Amino acid sequence: RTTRDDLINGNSASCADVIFIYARGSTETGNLGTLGPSIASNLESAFGKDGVWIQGVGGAYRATLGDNALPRGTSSAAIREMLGLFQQANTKCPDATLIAGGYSQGAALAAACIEDLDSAIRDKIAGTVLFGYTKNLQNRGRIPNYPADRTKVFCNTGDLVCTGSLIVAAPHLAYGPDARGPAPEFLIEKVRAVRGS
């Protein structure tokens, strides 16, 4: 449900084939928040419980609302925490395919992290989904240094954070349907594109 630490808790001798690392929105609970559990259940349906590890970004990422106003749309400490998780994935399970996602401040965090990542690890993230992307206008719907065909952005009409503002309006809280259907669909398709099935 809202906390999943499958990568941290997982045995290196029995690595999953797919590792999903997800950052929640501001003020959300656990390390998956309101959208991550829906994505997790559909990934588990696709690859099996032993086939995918679900890992939320916890630790130093406090998901504090005020940090949306910092230069990268989150804190330096939160970026360091997500970078450390990707580096743990890469060390613990070098053959696993990675996928990533984030909502709101967590979408900014995922984009900042992927931009800073060593390219050999970045290139293992087969697909990333971003919901209510707070840097959508500033980055022109892209994650710096990462291909557009591996990116999917869900930005609702009237969600002001997608249009350069930091105002939270009702469309910002309406990504439930996307997290249940098209976002797992996209991630599964991108994993099968490189892994076959």
Side-chain angles (χ1 to χ4, degrees):
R1 198 202 300 269
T2 47
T3 298
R4 271 280 213 110
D5 286 298
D6 298 356
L7 169 62
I8 292 175
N9 291 336
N11 274 97
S12 186
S14 52
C15 276
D17 298 333
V18 182
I19 302 183
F20 179 57
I21 299 171
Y22 177 84
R24 75 178 137 136
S26 295
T27 329
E28 291 197 319
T29 63
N31 62 191
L32 296 184
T34 61
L35 304 183
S38 300
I39 302 165
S41 305
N42 281 299
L43 288 173
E44 289 167 1
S45 291
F47 305 113
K49 278 278 201 182
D50 298 89
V52 61
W53 280 351
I54 307 297
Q55 177 62 242
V57 178
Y61 179 42
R62 290 312 129 154
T64 301
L65 183 65
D67 291 347
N68 285 295
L70 292 182
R72 303 190 76 185
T74 189
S75 65
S76 298
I79 293 169
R80 187 116 170 203
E81 185 69 40
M82 195 176 190
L83 282 171
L85 286 174
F86 275 104
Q87 289 165 351
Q88 295 180 53
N90 184 63
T91 296
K92 234 184 197 183
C93 306
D95 299 318
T97 303
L98 308 182
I99 34 165
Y103 167 46
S104 195
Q105 184 176 162
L109 169 54
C113 173
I114 290 176
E115 180 183 12
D116 291 358
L117 261 183
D118 173 74
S119 64
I121 305 177
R122 179 165 56 231
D123 292 344
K124 290 179 172 194
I125 310 169
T128 303
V129 289
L130 299 176
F131 305 89
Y133 186 26
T134 60
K135 293 299 189 194
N136 181 245
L137 186 61
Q138 297 94 328
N139 288 339
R140 295 314 188 262
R142 295 292 218 92
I143 296 170
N145 298 329
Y146 187 72
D149 64 286
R150 309 227 301 191
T151 310
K152 190 165 181 74
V153 177
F154 292 96
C155 258
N156 284 334
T157 305
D159 181 354
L160 301 183
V161 305
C162 296
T163 242
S165 164
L166 285 176
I167 296 300
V168 178
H172 195 52
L173 284 29
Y175 291 105
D178 293 320
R180 287 175 220 130
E185 186 183 340
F186 178 76
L187 292 178
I188 294 165
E189 170 183 285
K190 290 301 165 181
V191 169
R192 297 217 256 237
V194 297
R195 291 200 151 253
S197 192

